[PDB]
Amino acid sequence: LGKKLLEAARAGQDDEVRILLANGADVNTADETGFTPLHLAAWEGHLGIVEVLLKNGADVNANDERGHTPLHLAAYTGHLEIVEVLLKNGAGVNATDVIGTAPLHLAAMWGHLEIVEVLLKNGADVSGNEWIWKLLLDALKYLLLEAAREGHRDRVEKLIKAGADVNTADETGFTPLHLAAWEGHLGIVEVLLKNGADVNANDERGHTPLHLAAYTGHLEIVEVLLKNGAGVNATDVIGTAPLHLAAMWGHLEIVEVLLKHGADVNAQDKFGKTPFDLAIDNGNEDIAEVLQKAA
């Protein structure tokens, strides 16, 4: 009966598991190295088996002979709904196995970042074996890049609190601060700068967060970046500075704050064009007037 219960759980045969339990099968039966039906269901992704077993008194924190719990197995195999059900039934979020890894680290092994984040929300402890720490810190990097583009301040704050490196970058050279400025997320710009983000990080085309905020016209982000030391005269690989971008795209208020913070009206891009020239070219007479008076 114990063998039948293990194999019915592995196969996801819910009504067969129900019958076996009703007929007295030990819900915490173990195979020869300590795997219980809940282990195998969690490994295999059979949520229905998981819920039936837990309803019938299964030990949510059963260990096999390597110290793995059902939450370890569900994390490693990427079964998010089972992770949630296990946690809701008292699974130990910080259970550690015989080599020191917890469910968060096994989830990171195959890139199961939503599970990593869920485990963080449920108390996953973030304080040679630094390989374990790298698993966490890399997952946090990827999560922070994702969260910074998305825009939710609470999510980013949580990831930074957990140890995410605010100065990481994606493969194009966009840091979280670039992404937050690009997408117009002022709240995340503020949080990143409060936590040590390089205000003048360059992507591979020489674009700083201030280039991106001037390009997109986000005045409040421009102002916060300038208050934190953004390079008002930084140039991209074609010589374009923030004042050029604000003039090209008709952002009069951004031209004004850039000028207040020391922007150089005489800077020429690689084509010899000053911000005034570009204002003229684009029919932005009001901006051209401001720049000529500041010449």
Residue numbers in the entry: 14 to 140, 157 to 324
What does the paper say about this structure?
In this paper, we present a strategy to fuse specific, high-affinity protein binders to obtain multivalent or multispecific scaffolds of predetermined geometry. DARPins are used as building blocks to confer the desired specificity to the construct. A series of rigid connector modules replacing the DARPin capping repeats allow to combine the individual DARPin domains in such a way that their distance and angle can be altered to test different geometries, bringing the binding partners of the DARPins into a defined spatial arrangement.
In the context of DARPin-β-lactamase fusions, we observed that the paratope of this DARPin has a high propensity to form major crystal contacts, leading to crystal formation under a wide variety of conditions. Indeed, constructs D12_Hxx_D12 with H02, H09, H11, H13 and H15 yielded diffraction-quality crystals in space groups P212121, P6122, P212121, C2 and P1, respectively, at resolutions ranging from 1.8 Å to 3.5 Å. The observed pseudo-torsion angle of 172° is close to the predicted angle of −176°, but the connecting module is partially disordered, such that the C-terminal DARPin is rotated 90° around its long axis. In this orientation, all four D12 units engage in paratope-paratope interactions, where two DARPin domains form an antiparallel dimer. The purple molecule in Fig. 5b shows the C-terminal DARPin packing against the green N-terminal DARPin, the pink molecule the N-terminal DARPin packing against the green C-terminal DARPin. Only a few structures show a kinked, disordered or dissociated shared helix (e.g. D12_H09_D12), but even then the DARPins stay fully intact, demonstrating that local perturbations of the structure in the helix region can be accommodated without unfolding the DARPin moieties. Occasionally, the DARPin fusion constructs would rather distort the conformation of the connector module than forgo the formation of such favorable crystal contacts.
